[PDB]
UniProtKB/Swiss-Prot annotation, chain A:
Family: Belongs to the aerolysin family.
Notes on the domains: The C-terminal propeptide is required for normal protein folding and secretion; it maintains the aerolysin precursor in its soluble form and prevents premature heptamerization and pore formation.
Superkingdom, natural source: Bacteria
Entry's localization field: Secreted; Host cell membrane
Subunit structure: Homodimer in solution; homoheptamer in the host membrane. After binding to GPI-anchored proteins in target membranes and proteolytic removal of the C-terminal propeptide, the protein assembles into a heptameric pre-pore complex. A further conformation change leads to insertion into the host membrane.
Sequence intervals crossing the membrane: none
Full-length numbering of the shown residues: 24 to 76 of 493
Described function: Secreted, cytolytic toxin that forms pores in host membranes after proteolytic removal of a C-terminal propeptide, leading to destruction of the membrane permeability barrier and host cell death. The pores are formed by transmembrane beta-strands and are approximately 3 nm in diameter.
Name of the protein in its database record: Aerolysin
Post-translational modification: Proteolytic cleavage and subsequent release of the propeptide trigger a major conformation change, leading to the formation of a heptameric pre-pore that then inserts into the host membrane.
Curated annotation (Swiss-Prot), chain B:
Modification after translation: Proteolytic cleavage and subsequent release of the propeptide trigger a major conformation change, leading to the formation of a heptameric pre-pore that then inserts into the host membrane.
Annotated protein name in UniProt: Aerolysin
Intracellular or extracellular location(s): Secreted; Host cell membrane
Similarity-based family: Belongs to the aerolysin family.
Biological function: Secreted, cytolytic toxin that forms pores in host membranes after proteolytic removal of a C-terminal propeptide, leading to destruction of the membrane permeability barrier and host cell death. The pores are formed by transmembrane beta-strands and are approximately 3 nm in diameter.
Domain free text: The C-terminal propeptide is required for normal protein folding and secretion; it maintains the aerolysin precursor in its soluble form and prevents premature heptamerization and pore formation.
Shown segment, full-protein numbering: 77 to 129 of 493
Superkingdom of source: Bacteria
Oligomeric and partner information: Homodimer in solution; homoheptamer in the host membrane. After binding to GPI-anchored proteins in target membranes and proteolytic removal of the C-terminal propeptide, the protein assembles into a heptameric pre-pore complex. A further conformation change leads to insertion into the host membrane.
Coiled coil: none
Length: 41, 53
């Protein structure tokens, strides 16, 4: 729904579509075999 | 007049029957309705397309 700038992201709200829109940047910023939730299951 | 089904090749010939096709007394119009416009926040051509899709 809203554009997300990767420099504003913070691993403490994040839709599935928002996570898919910026995917490579989010994947690159997390460790291998790390699992973190987005929203609504 | 009567209408015949498949196997009779849909032939229409004079006849008699008690089961009659009938267009209802007051049929309705099946037009596609028109909805109110959808407003997208202002930006450049690509921003608007991104917000749309």
């Amino acid at each position: 729904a809203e554009p997300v700038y990767p420099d504003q992201l913070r691993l403490f709200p994040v839709n599935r579509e928002e996570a898919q829109s910026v995917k490579s940047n989010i994947v690159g910023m997390m460790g291998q075999w790390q699992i973190s939730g987005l929203a609504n299951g | 007049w009567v209408i015949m089904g498949p196997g009779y090749n849909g032939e229409i010939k004079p006849g008699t029957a008690s089961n009659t096709w009938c267009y209802p007394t007051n049929p309705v119009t099946g037009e596609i309705p028109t909805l109110s416009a959808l407003d997208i926040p202002d930006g450049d051509e690509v921003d608007v397309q991104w917000r749309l899709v």
